Design a protein around this ligand. Structure first.
Ligand code: BWY
Length: 840
């Protein structure tokens, strides 16, 4: 390659955090094969995008204006404050007017046609053939009662986005030679054996075991494990799962490679160790640490192409109506399979139908592909996100089954792709092969829209930086995106990466300078300021896009306002000046850098919270959640958005009584009244407290994270309650302590108007979520599988079934949640005290 070609690859390696040209941990060429394969999908999307619209990336929805936003429009009139340098003029606009129309009514209101409306202080453009009511920034201002402020400037030049040009009927058997680990402690007396499983979509097609032997550094067997399944019956995507029991170690091997070739020859596989079921157990990558890991040595030596009776119908309809977690009896599977063509008429049956396929039989697999040829009902069906996500989880390894799921995602608009982007990225872990329709879909949508591409960058990079199991696959996908996003975005990502990596280093250096066991000294703060002083000059980039808020550009550090938080983790509290002079306020941009909690769990929770917001929006319900920004950037390290004018509920308590323990009921209401500028703003804060407390009580109860220490609950000075710090997990279903009830005017068995409103809001929000039970269940199970240490498959996932009271009518569901509110009233301060004791 050319000299600049090598320098460009080094540029990509720095952005990715991993060298895709490094081949220290591969036993085939699938990764390089995938790099070539993703060239055509990338270039096809680069060729299809409009240069002007890609440069301005308008954030737009097609959903109707919610009712709670329509009543916020007084006279079918929306006010836009248009700025031109130091001047400003207010314009009345119809909710259906387009940006081009309101631009015309602006110049006409005077008495060259190449200007653009941009949000003041943000890289957010109000352009395109779209009603102004369908811009997300307009709806954000409507919901929060902010004035729509816009500047009149020049569109960004699409030339900046330039992309650089490219340049056997025999039974299956495996020989288990032995296992090897370099060092083993002298002590104890341990036995060990090897379990060999043929797996497809977590179905165990066949299983064989070796004999148990004493556990030494080298254990040898030299046995043939002969299975009953024939070679010609091995489905594509099937895994040879090898596991050592004393479960201690595991490793997987694709029996059919990316070229439809049966795996053959000698293999020395370095295995993963179980830390003292989940997505990591499905990876075909081997342990990169080949010096100290357990290895297993095997030998492979063994090509593809190329009406119901009314009572049985009732049983089938009952099977289809059950939740995605309901286990399928063998009788149920034979029912779904034999009445194949009736099951095809029910889109919600497809997950259970394909779980009834005998994937270990080639003739049955062929019958399944014949079934999917007549796909009229599925192609015409309305897009069901939850249904589609079921077909992309760990239970389906067939490429054609997963392909028809990705086909349905193609109709998602950019607004909804952003809602599910994080989950779709995680679902790549469930793909048997590196190059898949799901991976190409993500690549496609990220290249089509700069906001999707921005979050796709940081979602992929988060896994690359800390997931040994999937960093190789995600790095090839990220490289494919970076080679098509354009020069301007490559420049932006470079500025962001250099900033976060410099701040990551400062974060780790500060935490080693202090201890959780002790308090924050002026010494530790002085160390921080000196380190930031060295970064600032020199050299910190002049500005960078905020990773969790790409519309915001942060400038220089305000070092005088930077400090180390008094928490146990000693996270950094950083504040940056805003680099956009057209901004309305001189407010700083606050960013928290924290080590070390798994912020990937925070990411998953906050994204589900935003999904619950969209669910409630479709029912004209506003619950006033506050899903702040949060992005994991490495192993137990990442960044968090600073919400202004907010404090923790524990700090409000301790402001009065101080490092106990003995919580008081009236302190929260006193705090809200003190922080309220007027009585009118105070009453609005209490109203916002009622809604947000109900929204979080319902949301945290469904997700099973309701029992929280009030140090992890925050409140804004404008009354917005919100939970924080999810990288963690007598009892309570949620937090509804006497201080919360006092704000609502209630104190121990005394129903107040605000508390009755809280009860009615909770029930309505709860019933609204139950109409999306299957969606919430699939998001919940996927979250445990891709974000948690280890997941019990059949029980941990079972909690949300009872929480969503599956199978009960709305009356029993309503009483169920009202009883949960009563448990909190009966428990009082008890559970909070036990949490405080747990943290003394
Ligand atoms: C608690 C922290 C471990 N954590 N862990 C995970 N997630 C979080 C988190 C998330 N958020 C916050 N924390 C947050 C905290 C505070 S207060 O703690 C802060 C108030 C300001 N003071 C100064 C001005 C420096 C004296 C210090 C204490 C204020 C605003 C916040 O933004 C909302 C999102």
């Amino acid at each position: 390659m050319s000299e600049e070609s090598q320098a460009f690859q080094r540029q990509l390696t720095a952005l990715i955090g991993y060298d895709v040209t490094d081949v220290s941990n591969v036993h085939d060429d699938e990764l390089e094969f995938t790099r070539r394969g993703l060239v055509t999908p990338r270039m096809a999307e680069v060729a299809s995008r409009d240069p002007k619209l890609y440069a301005m990336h308008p954030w737009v929805t097609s959903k109707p204006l919610p009712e709670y936003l329509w009543k916020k429009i007084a006279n079918n009139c929306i006010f836009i404050v248009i700025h031109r340098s130091t001047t400003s003029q207010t314009i009345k606009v119809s909710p259906d007017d387009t940006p081009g129309a309101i631009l015309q009514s602006f110049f006409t209101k005077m008495a060259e046609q190449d200007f653009v409306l941009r949000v003041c202080g943000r890289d957010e453009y109000l352009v395109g053939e779209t009603p102004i009511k369908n811009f997300q920034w307009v709806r954000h201002c409507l919901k929060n009662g902010e004035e729509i402020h816009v500047v009149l400037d020049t569109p960004p030049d699409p030339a900046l986005d330039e992309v650089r040009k490219e340049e056997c009927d025999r039974k299956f058997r495996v020989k288990i030679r032995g296992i090897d680990i370099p060092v083993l402690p002298r002590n104890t007396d341990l036995t060990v054996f090897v379990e060999a499983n043929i797996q497809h979509g977590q179905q165990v097609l066949c299983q064989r075991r070796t004999s148990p032997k004493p556990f030494t550094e080298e254990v040898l067997w030299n046995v043939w494990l002969e299975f009953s399944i024939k070679i010609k019956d091995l489905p594509k995507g099937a895994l040879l799962n090898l596991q050592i029991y004393c479960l201690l170690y595991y490793v997987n091997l694709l029996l059919i490679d990316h070229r439809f070739l049966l795996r053959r020859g000698e293999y020395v596989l370095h295995m993963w160790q179980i830390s003292g079921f989940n997505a990591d157990k499905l990876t075909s990558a081997t342990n990169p640490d080949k010096e100290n890991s357990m290895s297993i040595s095997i030998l492979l030596d063994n090509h593809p192409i190329a009406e119901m009776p009314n009572q049985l119908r009732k049983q089938l309809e009952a099977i289809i109506a059950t939740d995605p977690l309901n286990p399928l009896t063998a009788e149920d599977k034979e029912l779904l399979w034999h009445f194949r063509y009736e099951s095809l008429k029910h889109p919600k049956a497809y997950p259970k139908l394909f779980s009834s396929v005998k994937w270990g039989q080639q003739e049955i697999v062929a019958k399944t592909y014949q079934l999917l040829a007549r796909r009229e009902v599925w192609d015409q069906s309305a897009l069901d996100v939850g249904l589609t996500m079921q077909l992309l989880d760990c239970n389906f390894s067939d490429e054609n089954v997963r392909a028809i799921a990705v086909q349905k995602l193609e109709s998602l608009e950019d607004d909804d792709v952003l809602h599910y982007l994080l989950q779709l990225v995680q679902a790549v872990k469930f793909e048997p092969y590196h190059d898949s329709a799901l991976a190409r879909f993500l690549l496609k949508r990220g290249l089509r829209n700069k906001r999707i591409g921005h979050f796709l960058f940081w979602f992929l990079r988060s896994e690359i930086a800390q997931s040994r199991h999937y960093q190789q696959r995600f790095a090839v996908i990220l490289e494919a995106y970076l080679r098509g996003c354009g020069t301007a975005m490559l420049h932006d990502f470079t500025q962001q990466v250099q900033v976060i990596e410099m701040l990551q280093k400062v974060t780790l250096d500060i935490k080693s300078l202090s201890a959780e066991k002790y308090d924050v000294s002026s010494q530790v703060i002085s160390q921080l300021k000196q380190k930031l002083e060295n970064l600032q000059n020199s050299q910190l980039p002049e500005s960078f896009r905020v990773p969790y808020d790409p519309g915001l550009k942060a400038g220089a550090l305000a070092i005088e306002k930077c400090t180390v938080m008094a928490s146990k983790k000693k996270p950094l509290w950083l504040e940056f000046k805003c680099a956009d002079p057209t901004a309305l306020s001189n407010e700083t941009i606050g960013i928290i850098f924290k080590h070390g909690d798994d912020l990937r769990q925070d990411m998953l929770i906050l994204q589900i919270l935003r999904i619950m917001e969209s669910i409630w929006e479709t029912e004209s319900l506003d619950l006033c959640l506050l899903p702040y920004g949060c992005i994991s950037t490495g192993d137990k390290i990442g960044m968090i958005e600073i919400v202004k004018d907010a404090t923790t509920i524990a700090k409000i308590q301790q402001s009065t009584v101080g490092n106990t323990g003995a919580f008081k009921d009236e302190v929260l209401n006193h705090w809200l009244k003190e922080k309220s500028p007027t009585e009118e703003k105070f009453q609005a804060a209490v109203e916002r407290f009622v809604y947000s407390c109900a929204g979080y009580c319902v949301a945290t109860f469904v997700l099973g994270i309701g029992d929280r220490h009030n140090d992890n609950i925050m409140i804004t000075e404008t009354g917005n309650l919100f939970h924080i710090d999810f990288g963690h997990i007598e009892r309570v279903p949620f937090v509804l302590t006497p201080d919360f009830l006092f704000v609502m005017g209630t104190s121990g068995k005394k129903t107040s108007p605000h508390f009755q409103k809280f009860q009615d809001i909770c029930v309505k929000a709860y019933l609204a979520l139950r109409h999306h039970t299957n969606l919430l269940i699939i998001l919940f199970s996927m979250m445990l599988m891709t974000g948690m240490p280890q997941l019990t498959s059949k029980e941990d996932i079972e909690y949300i079934r009872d929480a969503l009271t599956v199978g009960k009518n709305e009356e029993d569901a309503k009483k169920y949640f009202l009883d949960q509110i009563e448990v909190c009233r009966d428990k009082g301060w008890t559970v909070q005290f036990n949490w405080f004791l747990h943290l003394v």
